[PDB]
């Protein structure tokens, strides 16, 4: 891929294939010229070295490097470890309809609801309010509704007061130890740029208010809303799964 | 930082990472363990297939969700198809059966 | 309205089939053009379906009976 500028961006694996079929063509030519056996012998040695360097660069005693004095990445180390496909791309993904911010307290809340900043809620619920502006007919085409939500009319705030009326969200803190780190809440829109959070939960998340950042997520389909409200909701989980002791102990 | 739907990556059809690049949030696999600790079957399904990887699933999701529908059409993650081609690219034939 | 879902577990004692029954019912009320039974308080179909579970007049059995009856009206009213 050409990136920003004249610079190109390649995988080293292109270079690796180029080495092996280069060397293959030279072996074909050396067999065509009827060379002595030392030449074709070492040519077959280097072809074996290039193939097995391509399948696993590093199981050889010295892994070959292409540039910058650093070993290039073969097909084997595209899979293993944390940087392979498994532990990086298929088992944990980066997900849309999400966000993060800094948290704070706000003790005026019931524990099945959490504060949420209004610019985030305007951001993460764009298809919903597009669908409602198409439904009520205040816009007609989609791009008119886009111009109505960037133009910031006063009527849209009612609209995301209905789409956040019984639509729960999921909250997360990044070192998720046990299963009380993903919990669902009904939202209440507030000002500012931080997520308020009920004070009987700071023990469950192991969350102190010195500047931790929480991630939010949205259930999209209807079955996910029922899984959130029936199981992920914060009132349903007051007892530990480790013992019968409650977690909602006042700190 | 917040994101409805932004740019997507090139080698794997996944969202980007960061704030400067208009990226999404990493949903790591410890959190996956947290979801199947619950009985949350559907939420775990749509949060790695529709919301991330299947291009046809996320287009049909977006069209249905602006049409007032709430329904998913999961299919297959594209990253698994990548891994299929890549370990297929060695001398290891793997396939999909009936 | 909806703070807990305890009554749904009290009237259907599995708690894992509740997402199936309320998912099927609320899908029958949002996309399928049919009315609820509990009166409306301007809520989403989730709370409507779960509250119909709280009323005990909706479960898997009665939905099977009425879908049975609907396709009976399809093949019976087809002529």
């Amino acid at each position: 891929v050409p990136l920003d500028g004249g610079r190109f961006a390649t995988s080293d694996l292109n270079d690796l294939y180029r080495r092996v079929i280069n060397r293959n063509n030279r072996l074909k030519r050396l067999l065509d010229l009827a060379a002595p056996d030392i030449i074709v012998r070492n040519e077959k040695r280097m072809l074996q070295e290039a193939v097995d360097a391509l399948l696993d660069n590093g199981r050889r005693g010295r892994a070959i490097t292409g540039s910058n004095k650093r070993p290039l990445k073969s097909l084997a180390d595209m899979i293993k470890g944390k940087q392979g496909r498994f532990r990086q791309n298929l088992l944990g993904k980066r997900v849309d309809y999400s966000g993060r911010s800094v948290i704070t307290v706000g003790p005026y809340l019931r524990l099945h609801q959490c504060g949420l900043p209004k610019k985030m809620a305007l951001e993460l619920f764009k298809p919903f309010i597009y669908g409602k502006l198409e439904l009520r007919g205040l816009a007609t085409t989609i791009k008119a509704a886009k111009k109505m939500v960037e133009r910031e009319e006063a009527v849209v705030w009612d609209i995301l007061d209905e789409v956040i009326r019984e639509h729960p969200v999921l909250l997360n803190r990044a070192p998720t130890l046990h299963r009380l780190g993903i919990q669902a809440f009904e939202p209440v829109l507030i000002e500012g740029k931080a997520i308020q959070l009920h004070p009987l939960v700071c023990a469950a998340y192991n969350a102190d208010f010195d500047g931790d950042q929480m991630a939010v997520h949205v259930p999209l389909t209807l079955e996910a809303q029922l899984e959130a409200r029936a199981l992920m909701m914060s009132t349903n989980n007051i007892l530990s799964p480790a013992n019968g002791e409650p977690i909602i102990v006042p700190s | 930082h917040a994101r409805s739907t932004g740019s997507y990556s090139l080698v794997t059809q996944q969202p980007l990472g960061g704030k400067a690049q208009f990226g999404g949030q990493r949903f790591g696999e410890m959190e996956v363990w947290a979801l199947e600790a619950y009985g949350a079957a559907y939420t775990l399904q749509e949060m790695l297939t529709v919301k991330s990887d299947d291009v046809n699933g996320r287009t049909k999701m977006y069209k249905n969700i602006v049409d007032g529908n709430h329904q998913m059409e999961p299919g297959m993650p594209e990253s698994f198809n990548v891994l299929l081609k890549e370990i297929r690219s060695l001398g290891i034939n793997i396939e999909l059966e009936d | 309205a909806r703070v807990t879902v305890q009554d749904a577990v009290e009237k259907i004692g599995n708690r894992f089939d509740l997402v199936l029954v309320a998912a099927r019912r609320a899908r029958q009320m949002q996309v399928g053009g049919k009315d609820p039974l509990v009166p409306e308080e301007n809520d989403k179909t989730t709370v409507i379906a779960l509250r119909e579970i709280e009323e005990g007049l909706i479960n898997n059995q009665i939905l099977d009976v009425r879908e049975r009856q609907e396709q009976q009206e399809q093949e019976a009213a087809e002529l």
Binding site: E227 | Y38, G39, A40, Y42 | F16, D17, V19, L20
Partner: peptide, 16 residues
């Protein structure tokens, strides 16, 4: 096949 998917695999496994 744990949460809802256990009933789903009872169904699909039952069909085979």
């Amino acid at each position: 096949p744990a949460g809802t998917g256990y009933a789903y695999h009872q169904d699909r496994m039952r069909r085979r």
